mmCIF file of all heavy atoms in Angstrom:
data_model
loop_
_atom_site.group_PDB
_atom_site.id
_atom_site.type_symbol
_atom_site.label_atom_id
_atom_site.label_comp_id
_atom_site.label_asym_id
_atom_site.label_seq_id
_atom_site.Cartn_x
_atom_site.Cartn_y
_atom_site.Cartn_z
ATOM 1 N N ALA O 96 83.922 3.600 32.720
ATOM 2 C CA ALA O 96 84.896 2.801 33.441
ATOM 3 C C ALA O 96 84.950 1.397 32.874
ATOM 4 O O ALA O 96 83.939 0.863 32.428
ATOM 5 C CB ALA O 96 84.575 2.761 34.923
ATOM 6 N N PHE O 97 86.145 0.819 32.869
ATOM 7 C CA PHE O 97 86.302 -0.607 32.644
ATOM 8 C C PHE O 97 86.754 -1.228 33.951
ATOM 9 O O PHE O 97 87.665 -0.709 34.612
ATOM 10 C CB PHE O 97 87.315 -0.880 31.540
ATOM 11 C CG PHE O 97 86.826 -0.513 30.167
ATOM 12 C CD1 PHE O 97 86.992 0.785 29.675
ATOM 13 C CD2 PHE O 97 86.195 -1.459 29.364
ATOM 14 C CE1 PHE O 97 86.539 1.134 28.404
ATOM 15 C CE2 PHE O 97 85.744 -1.122 28.080
ATOM 16 C CZ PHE O 97 85.919 0.179 27.600
ATOM 17 N N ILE O 98 86.097 -2.319 34.338
ATOM 18 C CA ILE O 98 86.403 -2.978 35.604
ATOM 19 C C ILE O 98 86.625 -4.473 35.425
ATOM 20 O O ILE O 98 85.720 -5.202 35.017
ATOM 21 C CB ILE O 98 85.312 -2.721 36.669
ATOM 22 C CG1 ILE O 98 85.144 -1.214 36.887
ATOM 23 C CG2 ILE O 98 85.663 -3.438 37.981
ATOM 24 C CD1 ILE O 98 83.915 -0.836 37.646
ATOM 25 N N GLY O 99 87.834 -4.920 35.730
ATOM 26 C CA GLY O 99 88.145 -6.335 35.701
ATOM 27 C C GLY O 99 87.697 -7.004 36.985
ATOM 28 O O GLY O 99 88.097 -6.601 38.076
ATOM 29 N N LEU O 100 86.863 -8.027 36.841
ATOM 30 C CA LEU O 100 86.389 -8.837 37.952
ATOM 31 C C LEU O 100 87.028 -10.242 37.893
ATOM 32 O O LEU O 100 87.591 -10.620 36.869
ATOM 33 C CB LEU O 100 84.855 -8.896 37.922
ATOM 34 C CG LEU O 100 84.007 -7.933 38.774
ATOM 35 C CD1 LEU O 100 84.785 -6.782 39.414
ATOM 36 C CD2 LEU O 100 82.804 -7.412 38.002
ATOM 37 N N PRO O 101 86.970 -11.005 39.001
ATOM 38 C CA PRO O 101 87.692 -12.283 39.105
ATOM 39 C C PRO O 101 87.196 -13.436 38.229
ATOM 40 O O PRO O 101 87.965 -14.364 37.966
ATOM 41 C CB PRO O 101 87.558 -12.639 40.595
ATOM 42 C CG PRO O 101 87.146 -11.336 41.270
ATOM 43 C CD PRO O 101 86.265 -10.693 40.257
ATOM 44 N N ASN O 102 85.936 -13.389 37.797
ATOM 45 C CA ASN O 102 85.360 -14.417 36.910
ATOM 46 C C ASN O 102 84.064 -13.947 36.242
ATOM 47 O O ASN O 102 83.543 -12.878 36.579
ATOM 48 C CB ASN O 102 85.161 -15.759 37.642
ATOM 49 C CG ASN O 102 84.391 -15.617 38.946
ATOM 50 O OD1 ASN O 102 84.950 -15.782 40.031
ATOM 51 N ND2 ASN O 102 83.108 -15.310 38.849
ATOM 52 N N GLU O 103 83.550 -14.733 35.295
ATOM 53 C CA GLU O 103 82.315 -14.381 34.591
ATOM 54 C C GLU O 103 81.078 -14.365 35.486
ATOM 55 O O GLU O 103 80.205 -13.503 35.330
ATOM 56 C CB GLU O 103 82.084 -15.308 33.402
ATOM 57 C CG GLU O 103 82.831 -14.880 32.159
ATOM 58 C CD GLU O 103 82.874 -15.954 31.082
ATOM 59 O OE1 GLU O 103 81.859 -16.674 30.889
ATOM 60 O OE2 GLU O 103 83.930 -16.066 30.418
ATOM 61 N N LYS O 104 81.011 -15.320 36.411
ATOM 62 C CA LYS O 104 79.896 -15.443 37.343
ATOM 63 C C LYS O 104 79.713 -14.163 38.170
ATOM 64 O O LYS O 104 78.580 -13.728 38.398
ATOM 65 C CB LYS O 104 80.110 -16.653 38.249
ATOM 66 C CG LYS O 104 78.867 -17.156 38.949
ATOM 67 C CD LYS O 104 79.126 -18.535 39.564
ATOM 68 C CE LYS O 104 77.944 -19.022 40.415
ATOM 69 N NZ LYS O 104 77.748 -18.232 41.677
ATOM 70 N N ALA O 105 80.830 -13.564 38.594
ATOM 71 C CA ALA O 105 80.840 -12.311 39.362
ATOM 72 C C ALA O 105 80.426 -11.111 38.504
ATOM 73 O O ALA O 105 79.655 -10.249 38.944
ATOM 74 C CB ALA O 105 82.221 -12.081 39.977
ATOM 75 N N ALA O 106 80.945 -11.074 37.281
ATOM 76 C CA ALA O 106 80.599 -10.053 36.295
ATOM 77 C C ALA O 106 79.095 -10.038 35.966
ATOM 78 O O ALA O 106 78.484 -8.962 35.893
ATOM 79 C CB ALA O 106 81.423 -10.251 35.030
ATOM 80 N N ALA O 107 78.518 -11.228 35.771
ATOM 81 C CA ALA O 107 77.083 -11.394 35.504
ATOM 82 C C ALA O 107 76.221 -10.922 36.674
ATOM 83 O O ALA O 107 75.147 -10.338 36.470
ATOM 84 C CB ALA O 107 76.768 -12.844 35.163
ATOM 85 N N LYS O 108 76.694 -11.183 37.892
ATOM 86 C CA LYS O 108 76.031 -10.706 39.093
ATOM 87 C C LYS O 108 76.114 -9.180 39.175
ATOM 88 O O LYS O 108 75.149 -8.523 39.569
ATOM 89 C CB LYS O 108 76.636 -11.354 40.339
ATOM 90 C CG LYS O 108 75.744 -11.299 41.568
ATOM 91 C CD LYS O 108 76.351 -12.086 42.721
ATOM 92 C CE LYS O 108 75.449 -12.013 43.949
ATOM 93 N NZ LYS O 108 75.917 -12.875 45.068
ATOM 94 N N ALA O 109 77.265 -8.628 38.789
ATOM 95 C CA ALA O 109 77.450 -7.180 38.711
ATOM 96 C C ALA O 109 76.471 -6.502 37.742
ATOM 97 O O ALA O 109 75.884 -5.471 38.078
ATOM 98 C CB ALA O 109 78.879 -6.840 38.346
ATOM 99 N N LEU O 110 76.300 -7.078 36.551
ATOM 100 C CA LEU O 110 75.337 -6.558 35.580
ATOM 101 C C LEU O 110 73.909 -6.604 36.120
ATOM 102 O O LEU O 110 73.165 -5.635 36.024
ATOM 103 C CB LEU O 110 75.403 -7.347 34.270
ATOM 104 C CG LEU O 110 76.207 -6.751 33.119
ATOM 105 C CD1 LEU O 110 77.714 -6.854 33.386
ATOM 106 C CD2 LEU O 110 75.834 -7.472 31.848
ATOM 107 N N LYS O 111 73.549 -7.750 36.682
ATOM 108 C CA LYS O 111 72.225 -7.991 37.201
ATOM 109 C C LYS O 111 71.885 -6.987 38.311
ATOM 110 O O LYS O 111 70.829 -6.364 38.285
ATOM 111 C CB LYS O 111 72.139 -9.444 37.704
ATOM 112 C CG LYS O 111 70.733 -9.954 37.962
ATOM 113 C CD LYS O 111 70.717 -11.446 38.272
ATOM 114 C CE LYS O 111 71.238 -12.254 37.086
ATOM 115 N NZ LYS O 111 70.590 -13.581 37.007
#
Side-chain angles (χ1 to χ4, degrees):
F97 289 87
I98 303 166
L100 264 11
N102 52 250
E103 276 166 38
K104 198 167 174 291
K108 200 174 180 174
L110 261 73
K111 194 172 298 211

